[PDB]
Amino acid sequence: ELPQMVQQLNSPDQQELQSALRKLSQIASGGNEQIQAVIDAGALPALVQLLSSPNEQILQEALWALSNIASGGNEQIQAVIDAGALPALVQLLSSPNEQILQEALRALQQIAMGGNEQIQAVIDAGALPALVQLLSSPNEQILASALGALANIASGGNEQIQAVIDAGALPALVQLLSSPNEQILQFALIALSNIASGGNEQIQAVIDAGALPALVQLLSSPNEQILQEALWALSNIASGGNEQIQAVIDAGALPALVQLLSSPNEQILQEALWALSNIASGGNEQKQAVKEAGALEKLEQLQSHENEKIQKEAQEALEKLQSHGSGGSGKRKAKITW
Amino acid sequence: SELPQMVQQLNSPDQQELQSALRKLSQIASGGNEQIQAVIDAGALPALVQLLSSPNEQILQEALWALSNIASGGNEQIQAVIDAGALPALVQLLSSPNEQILQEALRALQQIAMGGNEQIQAVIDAGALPALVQLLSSPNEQILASALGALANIASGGNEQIQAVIDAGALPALVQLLSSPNEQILQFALIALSNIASGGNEQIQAVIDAGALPALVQLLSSPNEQILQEALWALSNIASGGNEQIQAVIDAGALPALVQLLSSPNEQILQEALWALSNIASGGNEQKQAVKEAGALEKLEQLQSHENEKIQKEAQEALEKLQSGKRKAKITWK
């Protein structure tokens, strides 16, 4: 009842082929247990070969199927890579069909939600040059699909992030910080924040790209979602060395971070605490700038906060502010799930 | 890089290979939040949830220890536990005969309930409230405290989450625990009632109709300063409603005690007595005249020269009010 459906993918009739494709696509959208049922039937080689069919009715339905399989576990995503789906997806990034492009874009986005070596498979397939060019797309829908796929690639290791920088994505991402589209502005902040989660060289690339003035300006944003992602980006830059933490300080972010410690939004408060705690993970010149901003006094009052999880986070930062070391900063790598 | 090696060991049939991997992963997640997402990155959640039905009680305890450390992270890391399907199991474990297993299942629910309001409603929609209210009459005061810790965090959500606690019959048993001889049972009872009083005016009136005011006014003369603090929060959230709710506090005789508490050497007690009177000052003149008739004018003027500058401002902010604030507390497993 299910192994016979995969045999219909070889049927030359477009009705039997699409009828079986819609059947295998819905069963895929169930649980991960139903995804493995499709995989162990031998459906991946047929779906990959259908990605080269000149019939867009089948190519679009085959993209819906392979995307739902890639929405499962990492060991199921790897099965898509070993089936040869990545070279077909990268070549489909130049299709004149707006829907075929966006479906192949979200397919790479969900593929890139796996491990670092599964993201590295996307990079080695050549999807980066097409994604960076798509950052300049005037179609904001195409731009969102490209931003979502690129940001998940930047959530890998230091080798994965450096490949995004070597492709030249930082100039477009920094320019996208001035976009009127709130969703585009949020996606660009996550991509920039994921890049600042690498080594000190990947962090200095964001600094040399001129992102700090826009990040500090976005701290006064009336959109709390933009303020959230802008806070994570500044904290990741504060997770590097002493010179990179000083760049955040020299940008003028401390008077805004300390004032956010009194925000009635508990989610916003913990992020400013996470940012100041990362800044406190620096040399004595960096710890002094936090004290001169009047944070020792606000951190002591937060030990009486109604949320006990906030009290502990204020104790950890206060210990790092009064210590003689400089370690303890933490990074963050976020995914953009579709 | 031995983290994925430990995760694959969660499928090992040997106990001391399985129990060794659960302990290392639990103490790794016991660190910071960056250490927690690492454990989540390797995919330990689907195996930790599966092992919640493990007939081995020691393996079940190690799995509950690990999941509770993961749920102690950020709100987005809590949703990863919820999306893994742990709430249905955690509610199933609320009927376990083992008291230790029951206590560890209550912690995970308590740590999860420290997230957003919609994350609290997921704990509610999973059927946790009936088991929690039924556990409020447990003779084990450590089981009762862990059930009170979870209920108090659930009542810290929105008005929909608070009304679900009220509709579960928690108000009667909560007032019963106000006369409890246990100090930590009493605090969690005051916090849960104070979190219920943080809702709408019809949710504050449910606390008033439950007969909580006479026990709260008596607790203002408690020798235990920790109990006196949480009791002041309960009366303050009740005075945050309308004029009919503020008058219920005055009619309970709280004004003579609140004015006297403005002279407690404990600075925390003093500021909480101020926040209560400031909320009472948010009513009509009939409520204001009762305040200054209780001798609150001259004490607010003496507080203008107190050594704490944040209390000086709060003194005149309430002094000019005579001539509207809530608090949602979230407690951590301890």
XYZ file of C-alpha atoms in Angstrom:
672
model
C 0.000 0.000 0.000
C 3.103 2.172 0.407
C 5.893 0.347 -1.488
C 3.518 0.321 -4.468
C 3.195 4.115 -4.272
C 6.938 4.546 -4.823
C 6.719 2.356 -7.932
C 4.172 4.808 -9.365
C 6.888 7.490 -9.389
C 8.302 5.711 -12.465
C 4.913 5.682 -14.215
C 5.062 7.774 -17.425
C 1.497 8.968 -16.768
C 1.447 12.402 -15.138
C -1.830 11.567 -13.375
C -0.553 8.411 -11.668
C 2.734 10.166 -10.874
C 1.159 13.227 -9.248
C -1.486 11.098 -7.518
C 1.293 9.094 -5.871
C 3.310 12.248 -5.165
C 0.447 13.872 -3.245
C 0.021 10.590 -1.358
C 3.695 10.271 -0.409
C 3.794 13.986 0.467
C 0.961 13.917 3.020
C 2.226 10.749 4.721
C 5.592 12.521 4.964
C 4.068 15.517 6.772
C 3.051 13.252 9.669
C 5.399 12.205 12.444
C 9.050 11.255 12.191
C 7.926 7.622 12.394
C 5.928 8.135 9.191
C 8.919 9.850 7.566
C 11.112 6.786 8.125
C 8.335 4.683 6.584
C 8.667 6.639 3.334
C 12.476 6.545 3.494
C 12.741 2.777 4.017
C 10.405 2.261 1.045
C 13.065 3.560 -1.354
C 11.461 6.897 -2.195
C 14.491 9.200 -1.904
C 16.221 8.184 -5.190
C 12.962 8.655 -7.110
C 12.223 12.067 -5.580
C 15.765 13.258 -6.338
C 15.486 12.181 -9.977
C 12.092 13.915 -10.199
C 13.822 17.198 -9.294
C 15.096 17.292 -12.901
C 11.735 16.710 -14.606
C 10.681 19.481 -17.026
C 7.117 19.229 -15.659
C 6.822 21.859 -12.926
C 3.636 20.250 -11.580
C 5.717 17.232 -10.554
C 8.865 19.205 -9.693
C 6.875 21.412 -7.306
C 5.137 18.418 -5.701
C 8.451 16.557 -5.443
C 9.914 19.593 -3.670
C 7.029 19.460 -1.183
C 7.806 15.801 -0.470
C 11.574 16.097 0.019
C 11.063 19.154 2.234
C 8.796 17.277 4.654
C 11.350 14.464 4.930
C 14.026 17.066 5.723
C 11.767 18.376 8.518
C 12.522 15.288 10.634
C 15.546 14.205 12.608
C 19.155 14.775 11.630
C 19.618 11.127 10.633
C 16.680 11.634 8.252
C 18.159 14.866 6.870
C 21.409 13.007 6.165
C 19.387 10.491 4.139
C 18.361 13.369 1.862
C 21.998 14.388 1.368
C 23.171 10.848 0.590
C 20.335 10.576 -1.955
C 21.984 13.345 -3.990
C 19.286 15.943 -3.369
C 21.668 18.837 -2.650
C 23.141 19.211 -6.187
C 19.621 19.266 -7.638
C 18.454 21.851 -5.092
C 21.421 24.164 -5.698
C 20.851 24.087 -9.459
C 17.142 24.786 -8.918
C 18.077 28.069 -7.208
C 18.302 29.586 -10.718
C 14.842 28.516 -11.881
C 12.720 31.246 -13.531
C 9.738 30.032 -11.465
C 9.204 32.062 -8.295
C 7.438 29.143 -6.598
C 10.058 26.572 -7.633
C 12.780 28.875 -6.291
C 11.062 29.455 -2.944
C 10.290 25.758 -2.446
C 13.909 24.825 -3.158
C 14.996 27.655 -0.846
C 12.895 26.434 2.082
C 14.153 22.918 1.317
C 17.745 24.047 1.866
C 16.606 25.999 4.939
C 15.225 22.885 6.645
C 18.216 20.821 5.499
C 20.466 23.415 7.155
C 18.741 22.818 10.521
C 20.962 19.792 11.192
C 24.505 19.335 12.390
C 27.525 21.305 11.259
C 28.584 18.626 8.767
C 25.072 18.566 7.307
C 25.258 22.337 6.859
C 28.751 21.879 5.412
C 27.216 19.562 2.810
C 25.007 22.461 1.704
C 28.045 24.736 1.412
C 30.051 22.152 -0.540
C 27.096 21.782 -2.932
C 27.502 25.440 -3.920
C 24.342 27.030 -2.511
C 26.174 29.991 -0.937
C 26.860 32.122 -4.070
C 23.184 31.994 -5.072
C 22.030 32.891 -1.551
C 24.274 35.950 -1.196
C 23.127 37.328 -4.555
C 19.505 36.770 -3.510
C 20.087 39.085 -0.532
C 19.799 41.962 -3.035
C 16.466 40.710 -4.396
C 13.784 43.422 -4.746
C 11.145 40.722 -4.156
C 10.781 40.743 -0.372
C 9.260 37.246 -0.404
C 12.315 35.836 -2.196
C 14.514 37.855 0.172
C 12.877 36.264 3.223
C 13.325 32.726 1.886
C 16.973 33.464 1.081
C 17.570 35.100 4.469
C 16.047 32.125 6.270
C 18.243 29.648 4.409
C 21.415 31.719 4.838
C 20.891 32.265 8.574
C 20.556 28.530 9.233
C 23.875 28.053 7.426
C 25.496 30.616 9.736
C 24.393 28.552 12.767
C 27.203 26.040 12.180
C 30.769 25.907 13.389
C 33.518 28.427 12.769
C 34.256 26.771 9.418
C 30.608 27.164 8.389
C 30.458 30.836 9.401
C 33.712 31.696 7.615
C 32.292 30.322 4.357
C 29.364 32.740 4.698
C 31.778 35.634 5.254
C 34.034 34.604 2.357
C 30.952 34.671 0.110
C 30.358 38.359 0.875
C 27.080 38.308 2.793
C 28.005 40.856 5.475
C 27.649 43.985 3.252
C 24.096 43.013 2.289
C 23.125 41.976 5.825
C 24.326 45.279 7.301
C 22.454 47.224 4.620
C 19.313 45.169 5.321
C 19.346 46.619 8.855
C 17.702 49.719 7.327
C 14.799 47.803 5.760
C 11.205 48.924 6.436
C 10.060 45.282 6.411
C 9.954 44.113 10.029
C 10.286 40.439 9.085
C 13.260 41.157 6.813
C 14.882 43.272 9.531
C 14.423 40.425 12.019
C 15.825 37.760 9.684
C 18.889 39.891 8.932
C 19.499 40.364 12.664
C 19.434 36.603 13.266
C 21.825 35.983 10.367
C 24.225 38.655 11.630
C 23.896 37.300 15.171
C 24.616 33.749 13.999
C 27.767 35.019 12.271
C 28.925 36.757 15.469
C 28.726 33.362 17.250
C 32.018 32.164 15.746
C 35.613 32.898 16.611
C 37.142 36.300 17.218
C 37.929 36.610 13.502
C 34.297 36.027 12.517
C 33.251 38.555 15.173
C 35.691 41.210 13.946
C 34.257 40.716 10.450
C 30.878 41.912 11.735
C 32.601 44.832 13.475
C 34.580 45.823 10.377
C 31.345 45.598 8.361
C 29.897 48.548 10.289
C 27.096 46.769 12.148
C 27.645 48.263 15.618
C 26.071 51.715 14.964
C 22.898 50.129 13.581
C 22.756 47.574 16.405
C 22.991 50.282 19.071
C 20.374 52.326 17.205
C 18.047 49.309 17.089
C 18.196 49.090 20.895
C 15.657 51.949 20.929
C 13.296 50.128 18.564
C 9.570 50.214 19.450
C 9.285 46.691 17.986
C 10.057 44.263 20.806
C 10.858 41.472 18.335
C 13.470 43.638 16.610
C 14.809 44.603 20.041
C 15.141 40.911 20.943
C 17.219 39.929 17.910
C 19.266 43.132 18.122
C 20.129 42.303 21.738
C 21.364 38.821 20.808
C 23.629 40.257 18.103
C 25.333 42.713 20.461
C 25.787 39.988 23.085
C 27.478 37.658 20.585
C 29.977 40.392 19.716
C 30.536 40.730 23.477
C 31.361 36.997 23.601
C 34.733 37.550 21.902
C 38.020 39.038 23.007
C 38.722 42.217 24.924
C 39.081 44.391 21.816
C 35.749 43.181 20.405
C 33.913 43.783 23.689
C 35.448 47.269 23.780
C 34.032 47.951 20.305
C 30.527 47.346 21.666
C 31.381 49.647 24.572
C 32.856 52.307 22.275
C 29.658 52.151 20.191
C 27.685 53.501 23.161
C 25.631 50.426 24.062
C 26.205 50.436 27.837
C 23.811 53.318 28.720
C 21.100 51.479 26.783
C 21.801 48.007 28.196
C 21.762 49.250 31.796
C 18.465 51.067 31.222
C 16.935 47.872 29.805
C 17.607 46.134 33.139
C 14.471 47.942 34.385
C 12.253 46.787 31.513
C 8.898 45.370 32.701
C 9.273 42.721 29.963
C 11.029 39.801 31.655
C 12.201 38.348 28.333
C 13.838 41.657 27.382
C 15.446 41.995 30.820
C 17.193 38.612 30.720
C 18.674 39.435 27.311
C 20.149 42.723 28.537
C 21.414 40.763 31.538
C 22.920 38.181 29.177
C 24.526 41.005 27.186
C 25.981 42.817 30.202
C 27.155 39.496 31.649
C 29.033 38.817 28.405
C 30.557 42.307 28.507
C 31.583 41.671 32.124
C 33.518 38.660 30.773
C 36.393 40.918 29.733
C 39.492 42.638 31.056
C 39.482 45.093 33.934
C 39.108 47.926 31.416
C 35.854 46.329 30.234
C 34.580 45.551 33.738
C 35.189 49.179 34.728
C 33.061 50.523 31.868
C 30.135 48.443 33.141
C 30.604 49.755 36.687
C 30.844 53.353 35.458
C 27.508 52.775 33.702
C 25.961 52.118 37.123
C 25.263 48.403 36.701
C 26.552 47.174 40.079
C 23.677 49.070 41.699
C 20.948 47.766 39.381
C 22.246 44.187 39.536
C 21.948 44.245 43.335
C 18.305 45.344 43.153
C 17.570 42.558 40.654
C 18.419 40.050 43.400
C 14.993 40.964 44.841
C 13.213 40.557 41.491
C 9.925 38.654 41.499
C 11.381 36.138 39.009
C 13.901 33.986 40.881
C 15.541 32.993 37.588
C 16.440 36.663 37.092
C 17.936 36.864 40.596
C 20.376 34.033 39.844
C 21.404 35.582 36.521
C 22.082 38.855 38.344
C 24.209 36.961 40.878
C 26.299 35.340 38.132
C 26.913 38.693 36.434
C 27.703 40.373 39.758
C 30.237 37.647 40.547
C 31.849 38.130 37.133
C 31.846 41.903 37.653
C 33.711 41.556 40.972
C 36.092 38.770 39.925
C 39.710 39.022 38.794
C 39.344 36.704 35.796
C 37.805 37.492 32.438
C 36.200 34.271 31.222
C 32.598 33.113 31.267
C 30.962 34.612 28.162
C 28.450 32.530 26.234
C 27.501 32.416 22.570
C 24.167 31.760 20.870
C 23.291 30.039 17.585
C 19.622 30.340 16.612
C 17.722 28.607 13.812
C 14.946 30.046 11.656
C 12.325 27.301 11.457
C 9.755 27.623 8.680
C 33.329 16.101 21.310
C 32.210 13.088 23.354
C 28.697 14.560 23.628
C 27.189 12.626 20.666
C 28.875 9.511 22.069
C 26.927 9.980 25.308
C 23.622 10.525 23.484
C 23.900 7.279 21.514
C 24.535 5.549 24.855
C 20.979 6.491 25.854
C 19.939 3.499 23.711
C 22.370 1.135 25.453
C 20.784 -1.958 27.061
C 23.395 -1.992 29.841
C 22.272 -0.031 32.890
C 25.660 1.239 34.037
C 26.368 2.406 30.489
C 22.943 4.064 30.400
C 23.104 5.416 33.956
C 26.622 6.768 33.382
C 25.511 8.721 30.306
C 22.475 10.191 32.082
C 24.642 11.512 34.926
C 27.240 13.150 32.675
C 24.574 14.753 30.479
C 22.712 15.990 33.564
C 25.789 17.677 35.049
C 26.669 19.164 31.653
C 23.190 20.700 31.444
C 23.661 21.825 35.062
C 26.082 24.487 33.810
C 25.187 27.547 31.761
C 22.596 27.883 29.031
C 25.188 27.431 26.275
C 25.946 24.032 27.816
C 22.230 23.178 27.765
C 21.685 23.899 24.070
C 24.708 21.692 23.362
C 22.870 18.756 24.956
C 19.804 19.735 22.926
C 21.876 20.002 19.731
C 23.000 16.369 19.956
C 19.375 15.227 20.235
C 19.114 13.949 23.815
C 15.515 15.126 24.278
C 13.789 12.355 22.238
C 15.652 9.683 24.215
C 15.132 11.361 27.597
C 11.372 11.499 26.979
C 11.268 7.851 25.881
C 13.096 6.786 29.057
C 10.407 8.487 31.176
C 8.433 5.232 30.818
C 11.441 3.116 31.828
C 10.331 0.520 34.427
C 13.705 0.984 36.160
C 13.166 3.507 38.952
C 16.836 4.529 39.117
C 16.977 5.152 35.362
C 13.699 7.061 35.676
C 15.231 9.247 38.396
C 18.343 10.027 36.338
C 16.174 10.952 33.347
C 14.022 13.261 35.473
C 17.188 14.819 36.909
C 18.462 15.514 33.390
C 15.243 16.926 31.922
C 14.799 19.246 34.908
C 18.250 20.754 34.321
C 17.371 21.362 30.663
C 14.041 22.968 31.592
C 15.961 25.308 33.928
C 17.297 27.189 30.886
C 15.751 29.860 28.714
C 12.144 30.012 27.584
C 13.098 28.784 24.106
C 14.872 25.806 25.680
C 11.733 25.033 27.702
C 9.669 24.857 24.507
C 12.163 22.313 23.163
C 11.265 20.105 26.133
C 7.548 20.699 25.546
C 7.852 19.981 21.821
C 9.648 16.734 22.715
C 6.443 15.438 24.325
C 7.516 15.420 27.969
C 4.392 17.017 29.472
C 2.111 13.964 28.918
C 4.659 11.722 30.647
C 5.296 14.168 33.501
C 1.561 14.211 34.241
C 1.483 10.403 34.102
C 4.305 10.325 36.662
C 2.107 12.357 39.046
C 0.411 9.041 39.922
C 3.629 7.141 40.647
C 3.782 5.230 43.956
C 7.416 6.235 44.508
C 7.572 9.485 46.463
C 11.018 10.324 45.075
C 9.869 9.779 41.480
C 6.812 11.928 42.195
C 8.991 14.723 43.590
C 11.229 14.774 40.503
C 8.216 14.881 38.176
C 6.919 17.895 40.108
C 10.230 19.725 39.639
C 10.179 19.423 35.847
C 6.624 20.775 35.821
C 7.725 23.569 38.168
C 10.712 24.520 36.005
C 8.644 24.395 32.808
C 5.969 26.612 34.388
C 8.571 29.405 34.726
C 8.210 30.242 31.021
C 5.709 32.207 28.994
C 1.977 32.186 29.592
C 1.271 29.946 26.592
C 3.894 27.519 27.905
C 1.981 27.484 31.200
C -1.312 26.720 29.439
C 0.384 23.721 27.816
C 1.034 22.380 31.319
C -2.611 23.136 32.130
C -4.027 21.542 28.967
C -1.921 18.443 29.708
C -4.082 17.792 32.782
C -1.645 18.761 35.551
C -3.948 20.902 37.712
C -6.245 18.085 38.986
C -3.270 16.048 40.207
C -1.715 19.135 41.819
C -4.857 20.099 43.750
C -5.265 16.478 44.839
C -1.659 16.540 46.095
C -2.340 19.603 48.272
C -3.820 17.210 50.870
C -0.830 14.853 50.866
C 0.538 13.970 54.331
C 4.063 14.227 52.872
C 5.037 17.871 53.359
C 7.855 17.587 50.809
C 5.386 16.276 48.226
C 3.056 19.122 49.214
C 5.819 21.720 48.853
C 6.801 20.472 45.392
C 3.140 20.539 44.345
C 2.804 24.052 45.774
C 5.927 25.135 43.896
C 4.424 24.020 40.592
C 0.990 25.514 41.310
C 2.503 28.860 42.321
C 4.349 29.125 39.001
C 1.210 28.153 37.071
C -0.747 30.926 38.809
C 1.914 33.397 37.591
C 0.544 33.306 34.033
C -2.229 35.270 32.395
C -5.842 35.566 33.466
C -6.718 32.428 31.487
C -4.042 30.467 33.362
C -5.147 31.842 36.743
C -8.820 31.033 36.145
C -7.860 27.447 35.299
C -6.264 27.164 38.746
C -9.405 28.644 40.315
C -11.712 26.285 38.407
C -9.618 23.347 39.677
C -10.613 24.067 43.282
C -7.200 25.266 44.450
C -8.508 28.259 46.423
C -10.157 26.186 49.217
C -7.095 24.012 49.872
C -4.784 27.039 49.634
C -6.570 28.853 52.470
C -6.354 25.619 54.476
C -2.556 25.796 54.177
C -2.501 29.328 55.617
C -2.849 27.794 59.100
C -0.087 25.260 58.361
C 2.680 24.716 60.947
C 5.286 24.461 58.156
C 7.005 27.711 57.220
C 7.965 26.715 53.662
C 4.486 25.289 53.053
C 3.099 28.618 54.265
C 5.303 30.699 51.950
C 4.310 28.716 48.855
C 0.667 29.013 49.918
C 1.027 32.791 50.209
C 2.858 33.041 46.877
C 0.258 30.955 45.036
C -2.576 33.017 46.521
C -0.667 36.220 45.752
C -0.203 35.084 42.146
C -3.925 34.337 41.842
C -4.668 37.831 43.181
C -2.551 39.227 40.312
C -5.385 38.609 37.842
C -8.571 40.484 37.085
C -10.947 41.945 39.642
C -13.191 38.876 39.396
C -10.131 36.721 40.110
C -9.157 38.831 43.118
C -12.728 38.576 44.415
C -12.413 34.786 44.245
C -9.583 35.069 46.780
C -11.677 37.393 48.957
C -14.715 35.102 48.828
C -12.443 32.165 49.722
C -11.881 33.716 53.159
C -8.192 34.571 52.787
C -8.211 38.127 54.171
C -8.712 37.227 57.883
C -5.752 34.832 57.747
C -3.599 37.320 55.820
C -4.238 40.129 58.314
C -3.310 37.821 61.198
C -0.069 36.869 59.418
C 1.033 40.525 59.500
C 2.045 39.920 63.140
C 4.108 36.799 62.346
C 7.571 36.621 63.957
C 8.960 35.020 60.774
C 10.033 37.853 58.472
C 10.009 35.559 55.427
C 6.344 34.683 55.992
C 5.595 38.358 56.666
C 7.059 39.276 53.263
C 4.949 36.891 51.174
C 1.855 37.833 53.188
C 2.412 41.504 52.342
C 2.539 40.587 48.646
C -0.810 38.797 48.925
C -2.581 41.763 50.520
C -0.982 44.109 47.971
C -2.192 42.190 44.909
C -5.682 42.117 46.436
C -5.540 45.899 46.910
C -4.613 46.274 43.221
C -8.213 45.696 42.089
C -11.188 48.012 42.236
C -12.579 50.030 45.111
C -14.690 47.047 46.200
C -11.561 44.898 46.587
C -9.615 47.615 48.415
C -12.515 48.124 50.828
C -12.449 44.400 51.622
C -8.856 44.784 52.836
C -9.776 47.809 54.965
C -12.800 45.989 56.400
C -10.444 43.133 57.330
C -8.508 45.502 59.601
C -5.223 45.614 57.685
C -4.707 49.380 57.984
C -3.584 49.403 61.668
C -0.949 46.749 60.933
C 0.294 48.280 57.668
C 0.896 51.641 59.345
C 2.838 49.958 62.157
C 4.921 47.967 59.653
C 6.179 51.299 58.271
C 8.579 51.357 61.250
C 10.068 47.862 60.934
C 13.897 48.012 60.936
C 13.881 45.487 58.082
C 14.097 47.621 54.944
C 12.363 44.977 52.817
C 9.357 44.809 55.161
C 9.168 48.614 55.163
C 9.067 48.922 51.373
C 6.428 46.191 51.025
C 4.219 47.962 53.566
C 4.616 51.071 51.400
C 3.626 49.268 48.195
C 0.475 47.978 49.904
C -0.574 51.422 51.135
C 0.202 52.902 47.711
C -2.228 50.435 46.130
C -4.816 51.204 48.808
C -4.312 54.879 47.928
C -5.429 54.033 44.356
C -9.087 53.980 45.447
C -11.730 56.590 46.113
C -11.669 59.166 48.882
C -13.528 56.727 51.146
C -10.484 54.452 50.924
C -8.034 57.355 51.249
C -9.695 58.844 54.338
C -9.426 55.459 56.064
C -5.665 55.476 55.432
C -4.893 58.880 56.950
C -7.303 58.166 59.811
C -5.015 55.212 60.604
C -2.140 57.626 61.266
C -0.388 57.037 57.938
C 0.196 60.723 57.139
C 2.799 61.451 59.817
C 4.694 58.206 59.189
C 4.936 58.923 55.457
C 6.450 62.300 56.364
C 9.039 60.739 58.683
C 10.038 58.331 55.897
C 11.076 61.354 53.810
C 14.323 61.461 55.837
C 15.042 57.718 55.703
C 18.583 56.667 54.780
C 17.292 54.833 51.683
C 16.655 57.221 48.801
C 14.419 54.799 46.892
C 12.155 54.686 49.954
C 12.132 58.494 50.225
C 10.572 58.789 46.764
C 8.106 55.952 47.401
C 7.034 57.779 50.569
C 5.980 60.982 48.801
C 4.658 59.110 45.757
C 2.139 57.580 48.187
C 1.836 60.721 50.327
C 0.657 62.796 47.345
C -1.558 59.921 46.205
C -3.674 60.390 49.332
C -3.824 64.154 48.753
C -2.758 50.111 40.778
C 0.251 47.783 40.736
C 0.620 44.000 40.517
C 3.355 41.400 40.972
C 3.818 37.981 39.338
C 6.302 35.844 41.270
C 8.119 32.818 39.838
C 9.918 30.486 42.246
C 12.677 27.983 41.530
C 12.975 24.434 42.854
C 15.003 24.497 46.067
